[PDB]
């Protein structure tokens, strides 16, 4: 009855969708969620509305939307909550959208940065 | 002799620079680097050229540039390597720039995503 929907920026290059895809597969490997979908905000399919619809059609009533972004910006504060109809201007009927928080300045990010700095 | 320069997208909102700042402070807390600076690609100061110059002025000869981005895109593949003069068409002379890789689909990111999914 819960779905994880991972949402990404999307690009004209393919690396953004590749990332969402690898992440979704990695969370699928962890067996924690009934349903797991990805959506991209601009330029790529699936789109965020499509991903949400797909999760409802598989029978989820609680949709957990996690924005896979480092920081808040225009997309996480306006565009995405719009697309999800959480803010005025698709149609869910009797499900609840749970819009989570971006990655932010997590200690794990600093771990990744130090590794990356040393080429690991 | 080595500097870490963390580079971010930058935004018209403040959250992007806030993130770089928190990250830089967190890597400062770990005492691993002689010198640590941040740069933002668009809309914010310091800029990437400024951050690089600032690191040279403090006496670094090896500048480690880490792009704090989830995925490769136009900025990490063209704009940033341009700004750093790694790519034809930004005044080092006897120092070397070491341009690292973005975060990518790291297992740590999946940890953060699951936490974020549960509102932690
Ligand atoms: Ni954008
Ligand atoms: Ni951009």
UniProtKB/Swiss-Prot annotation, chains A, B:
Origin: domain of life: Archaea
Cysteines engaged in disulfide bonds, as pairs: none
Annotated metabolic or biological route of this protein: Cofactor biosynthesis; adenosylcobalamin biosynthesis; cob(II)yrinate a,c-diamide from sirohydrochlorin (anaerobic route): step 1/10
Residues at which substrate binds: 45, 70-75
Catalysis performed (reactions): Co-sirohydrochlorin + 2 H(+) = sirohydrochlorin + Co(2+); Ni-sirohydrochlorin + 2 H(+) = sirohydrochlorin + Ni(2+)
Example GO BP: methanogenesis
Record-annotated active site: 9 (proton acceptor)
EC number: 4.99.1.3, 4.99.1.11
Amino acids binding Ni(2+): 9, 75
Residues annotated as binding Co(2+): 9, 75
Top class in the EC scheme: lyase
Any one GO molecular-function label of the UniProt entry: cobalt ion binding
InterPro entries the record matches: CbiX-like, SiroHydchlorin_Cochelatase, Sirohydro_Cobaltochel/CbiX
Keywords attached to this entry: Cobalamin biosynthesis, Cobalt, Lyase, Metal-binding, Methanogenesis, Nickel
NCBIfam families xrefs: F430_CfbA, PRK00923.1
Function per UniProt: Catalyzes the insertion of Co(2+) into sirohydrochlorin as part of the anaerobic pathway to cobalamin biosynthesis. Involved in the biosynthesis of the unique nickel-containing tetrapyrrole coenzyme F430, the prosthetic group of methyl-coenzyme M reductase (MCR), which plays a key role in methanogenesis and anaerobic methane oxidation. Catalyzes the insertion of Ni(2+) into sirohydrochlorin to yield Ni-sirohydrochlorin.
Description of how the protein assembles with itself and partners: Homotetramer; dimer of dimers.
Family to which the UniProt record says this protein belongs: Belongs to the CbiX family. CbiXS subfamily.
Protein name according to UniProt: Sirohydrochlorin cobaltochelatase
Species assigned in the record: Methanocaldococcus jannaschii (strain ATCC 43067 / DSM 2661 / JAL-1 / JCM 10045 / NBRC 100440)
